[PDB]
């Protein structure tokens, strides 16, 4: 199983936030930790993406673009899986040192997004998602959001996306019913990532007022790339309508 062998081999390990859990919770400290964790997860997403089958065939500017646009959905989907595997979806397992109960969900001012992520986590159980389906679906999320004006080499992106869809068909192979379930789940990531992008953007704009720290790469991506998504210049590729 060459393709799956590779996906298993490149899967990131454990990433910690560096949060101080030995202190009462506050909005500013929770969000400063989420921002630091997002920067550390982005570094791991870069190392992972560069090692994916075929990814180096894309134009380098397209490699960078798709990682920056898809990062939030990749992170949502991986966190939903960790939450399912580690705590049976009872809390959101952002990191081993950043685990959100409902109180923290509320305190973060991201409560609606968190409830939707907990529901995603539960779906992993409800739909009996296998670890191999998880790995193939997460890779496909890298190839699921692009600019309306086109990538530099759009044809090479389309071919690589199609090949990942073929690998998902091979893992499924009753096949249609499963494809329907998995593509509905994939499509459900996108509105959650949309709402997290909106929150992140608004928080960056008011960050000095609320004492939240953003690392350099997070501030750049949220100010340069995220607004292309919010302004409708970069859009998800949905399976179902939508």
């Amino acid at each position: 199983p060459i393709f799956l062998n590779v996906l298993e081999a490149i899967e990131p390990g454990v990433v910690c936030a560096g949060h101080d859990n030995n202190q009462p919770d506050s909005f500013a400290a929770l969000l400063s930790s989420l921002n630091e964790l997002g920067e550390r997860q982005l570094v791991h997403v870069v190392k992972w993406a560069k090692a994916l089958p075929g990814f180096r065939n894309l134009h380098v500017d397209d490699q960078m673009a798709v990682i920056q646009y898809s990062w939030m959905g990749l992170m949502v989907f991986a966190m939903g899986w960790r939450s399912f595997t580690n705590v049976n979806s009872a809390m959101l397992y952002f990191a081993p040192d950043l685990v959100f109960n409902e109180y923290r969900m509320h305190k973060s001012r991201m409560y609606s997004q968190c409830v939707r992520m907990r529901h995603l986590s539960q779906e992993f159980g409800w739909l009996q998602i296998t670890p191999q389906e998880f790995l193939c679906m997460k890779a496909l999320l890298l190839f699921s959001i692009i600019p309306v004006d086109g990538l530099k080499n759009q044809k090479f992106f389309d071919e690589l996306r199609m090949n990942y869809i073929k690998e998902l068909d091979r893992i499924i192979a009753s096949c249609s019913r499963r494809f329907y379930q998995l593509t509905k789940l994939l499509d459900s990531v996108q509105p959650i990532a949309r709402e997290l992008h909106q929150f992140a953007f608004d928080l960056l704009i008011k960050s000095h007022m609320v004492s939240v720290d953003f690392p350099e790469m997070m501030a750049e991506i949220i100010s340069v790339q995220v607004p292309k998504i919010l302004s409708g210049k970069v859009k998800p590729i949905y399976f179902h309508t939508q």
């Binding site: 870069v46 380098v60 920056q68 350099e216």
Partner: peptide, 9 residues
Amino acid sequence: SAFSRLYTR
């Protein structure tokens, strides 16, 4: 960009 500097390492 900070991202592109990271990527091109």
